[model samples]
Target: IIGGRESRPHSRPYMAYLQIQSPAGQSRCGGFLVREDFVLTAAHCWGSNINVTLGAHNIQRRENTQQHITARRAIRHPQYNQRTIQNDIMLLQLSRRVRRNRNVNPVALPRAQEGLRPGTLCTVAGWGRVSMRRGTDTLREVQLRVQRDRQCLRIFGSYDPRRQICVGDRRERKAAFKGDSGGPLLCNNVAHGIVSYGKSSGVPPEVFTRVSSFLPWIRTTMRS
Candidate 1:
């Protein structure tokens, strides 16, 4: 994240580093653990041979707190719109249940249909790029303010309030940049949004898939 500070080691225990093997090459995205067998991320991050690294602080160095696990399967939202980036959430079923530890735990989810007011402060963290051409090995976090629906609608014509949340500001230097997709927009210790899409130019006013909007889908998908 740009203009953010490095997070305390293991402070964000739910953070997950997603390694994706696409046909083009290796790519990565941010994710978070929601359950022992489920890791939530963005649908656009989906690729073959997906594996998750949990309890990581600095991904470059091998950390004893980290747990590497392969994804047994992936389930994307049925109505995900690639063109408009609507419903961009996905769930990765881990090959095995995660062992509970101080450095590895799950984040809570917002209640179904829960809503956040504009001007509320939320936290977003990732190992994504700190600049256009560079990324960090350690996790970084920034404070982003929840924005109004109209602000996003003015920028992204495809912005849908029912499924998305607007964050950051057009002039804000602190914002989530490239490779931050699939991370969480945490508020009051609850995950309210999943990093979806935003301007590639590193601009603010990004869009996130509203977690509360997909509560039923998440629960059912995890069950089946």
Candidate 2:
């Protein structure tokens, strides 16, 4: 597994699971606790027979102070597509409401008027695979600063779609990789981005689904 200093002492408790089954069960994708019954994830993680496990450092063990429940419903953005990565977002309705605690609490959604701009500091956490080519069993996290859209466009060009926001250093070597997708990109303690994709080689200007761009959809989808 890749090693780095733990950036945040307070790990935002969230639940995530892979869309796969069988001997390779239980992989980590990052998600945020949005409400008592809903968790946010990437649309790519949604599929048949999806399962969620909460309250553990690793996915191997299912028993602990956490909860494991089957998804009641998997809601994908109406416009999402794997090929183009448009509207790459999803929400999971838990079979039962999760008990909130210090380790498990819903993160506040970003205000409509606020948007994470370049140079903004943010934190991300995940149980994603350690390296792009290899998977890992432990959770990992890091702090990243947002890069300006102009600078990002210069590096990624057309690949950085408007629906997405880019973060990470340009000249420095740092980024979110394979397993980091679907995790939260927290700015000022509020979730501003959802880790989506990046070059397999871990290049700068990694792309994340911009939360500000979809607030309306999120509200409409989660309305009780």
Candidate 3:
């Protein structure tokens, strides 16, 4: 995460690490447990044998807090676009239900179309690149204020409020990158967005998949 610091264990209990089998070897993306049997991630994070590690603060250490599970299936939003990077949400079906306790808990989905107001402070947590040459093994979090869609158009030239929300602290010069994909953007302990994309070197408002706009799809997908 850009300009983010280490997150305490269980502070964000729904945090998920997506371990994907790639041609180059194992690569990862961040995600969250939205249901006992479902993990929410980016559609593009897909690869061979995608597995999830829940309740893990450190990827290297295996303890009771971590529950590693294989995915029974991976479902991408039908309209997800690789080229345009729109509708980039996905759901991974866990092979079994996970035990919820101190270290494991699911995130609460926002009511449909209930978007957070612009300028609201939000936090995103992930295990991702700290800098151009550095990566973090532990979960890290960064604060961002929701930006108006008008500001997003000014920053990105083109933006769709129907699917995206822009975040980041311009003064802090931080934004999520690479491995931070699919992570949660939490406000008031509710997941409001998912890490999508941003500039690599400078502070540009990062785009996230707005969670509220897709609530109907999420609920339907989870139920079906």
Candidate 4:
């Protein structure tokens, strides 16, 4: 059986939206609410033209309603590398602070005392495509178990447990896919990871950015 524990009763609120030339644009990645003024997403999603949508069940409805908030600035991790995909995280600063609503609330960060071990069960949510071809116009959530570092290293040679985390689902080929990037990986009731990459070969190992590794950086950036 997939290890770890079941998803917590408290569901964390988050969203994924995109900035397009037209008023209508599709969300490219999912992200979690980390604070009232900030949302955590993948650095790749940052650009001059983009808006952050909140309180929407779907990306298509973001522009049509007042639920979404436009971003004033986007801060990408200084160490982020587009090639190696190192430090693939970003922070979105909203023009106005987000109101904590049912669909938009900050999630608790993992504590330093808490350690993530193999067989740990976690959940990931996003608005990415369900399949290679089918797009998810609405948000979706999935559960997975933490894979052993060695098992993941076998598949992803560059795996670095210090900076990266891995999760898998044996029941189905299902794991976080394209659109799930930047989504939260929740362990127990705390957010411990951010969806970053999937195995190039198949759906076996999904890689994420370890939350602990970037805690200091997040504090420094957000506080500044």
Candidate 5:
């Protein structure tokens, strides 16, 4: 995050950190707990040897509140497109049900196919880069305002409002950077969006997967 601060210890308990070891190499992404056995993230984060760490604040420390578990399955949205970056959501089935505590809990999803209004304040947190050359070990967060669909279209000609949300402002100092992918965009304490993409320059007005659009998929996937 740019122009952000370290989050209070486990304040956002549902926040998750993912460690993925693919044939290419190891990579990391942010995620969130939605159920005892499921984690919500981005489809692009899919990789082998995936592990999840919940109840984390400062990942560099060995906190007793942390719950580390391996991922048993990764279910990316059926329509996910690598070329256009559409439907970039994914769900990981944990190896086992995780215990719930003050520092470990599931975040509520959007009530339904609800849409957030432009200018509404929301928050996105991650242990991602504080700068292009630096990454943080502690979870950091910044408040971002919802932007109109046109704002994104101005930058990304393919910006789709149906499955994506525009957030932050290029003029602002706050923004989400690398390693923040798959993290939740919190609005009214609900998971309204999933971090998806942004300019490589770390500019604001990033795109996020509209969580409400995938409500059915999430429900059905969790059921089976």
Candidate 6:
């Protein structure tokens, strides 16, 4: 959604649009379906009257493949704040289990014990900003590298290595921006990180919530 080309519908079936209804309008952040009735997103994205749209490529047009479901509950991390933005992850329980099909499914979460190594390339997709390219009304995707944390630390000053993983857009010109939170930073076919923290704007060392660090919490939360 932030910096890339349009994604075809059903290409990223698990991708989710976390839409929060407000008086002004609707605020959106990216997310993904992890289970039949579970959605993973950033804790900071928490809000009211939220709807989770899955299998959607064009948000404006309601296709037969798309499923618009209300969120039954939102469970935020115990410690999340704008001041520090730590543990910026959350789980949204869908009102009912989604009927999985070719256009709606779940993504695989990375193993907690065997985490990612260095030099990993990840694909980030979202429908955040209205549109980066004309004639496109769909979610976009851009490939970025899982960067070293030291680069982010240099700018942010305070960074938690255990919970966050830094990513840099390989092309210096593009990086994920605002309204792109809670999305998945997928490596290969696995979700290894959640779109978490970043600078006020721009691609300046985006820090994502490492999935391995929170898989236990996610599993436990789903069981509850």
Worst 10 residues of 2 by lDDT: 1-10
Q: Give lDDT tens digits, candidate 1, residues 1-224.
A: 98899999999899999989855238999999999999999999988789899999999988998899999998889998888888899999999999989999999999999999999999999999999878898999999999999999899989999899999977778888788899999998899999888887878888999999999999999987
> In terms of TM-score, which candidate is stronger, 4 or 5?
5
Reference-based lDDT, residue 30, model 3: 91
Clashing pairs in 6: none
In candidate 3, how many Å is residue 37 off?
Answer: 0.2
Which residue pairs show collisions in model 1? none
Task: Output the TM-score of candidate 1.
Answer: 0.97
Residue pairs in candidate 5 whose N, alpha carbon or C atoms collide under 3 angstroms:
none
How many clashes in candidate 5? 0
Q: How well does each candidate superpose onto the true structure, as a TM-score?
A: 0.97, 0.87, 0.95, 0.85, 0.97, 0.92
Model 2, 1-224: lDDT tens digits are 12333333235576454444444554446576688888888888776766666665666665465666677888999888888676889988888888777656688888764666678878777766656567656566777878877775676544454578878875655567776778788788888889887776777778888887788888888895
lDDT of 6 by residue, 46-141 (tens): 998898889888888878888989999999987777678888899999999999999999999988854665568788888766234332357888
Model 4: per-residue Cα lDDT over 1-224, one tens digit each: 11222223224455545452334554466777788988888887766756767766655653333356777788899988887777888888878898776667788887553558988878877766666556666666777889888776787666787888878855566677776788888888788988888755436677888887888888888898
Whichever of 2 and 6 has more lDDT, that candidate is 6
Q: Write the per-residue lDDT of candidate 3 for residues 42-116, one digit (tens) a residue.
A: 998977688789989888787679999888988999999888788889999999998888798899888888877
Candidate 3: where is the Cα deviation over 4 Å? 22-25
Across residues 1-224, which tens digit of lDDT does each residue of candidate 5 receive?
88899998889999999999864238999999999999999999998789899999888888999999999999989988888888999999999999988999999999677999999999999989999889998999999999998899888867899889999977788888899999999999999999999999888899999999989899999998
lDDT of 4 at 181: 82
Name the lDDT of candidate 1.
Answer: 0.91
Model 6 per-residue lDDT at 122: 85
Model 4, global lDDT: 0.72
Q: Which ten residues in a row have the lowest lDDT in candidate 5?
A: 19-28
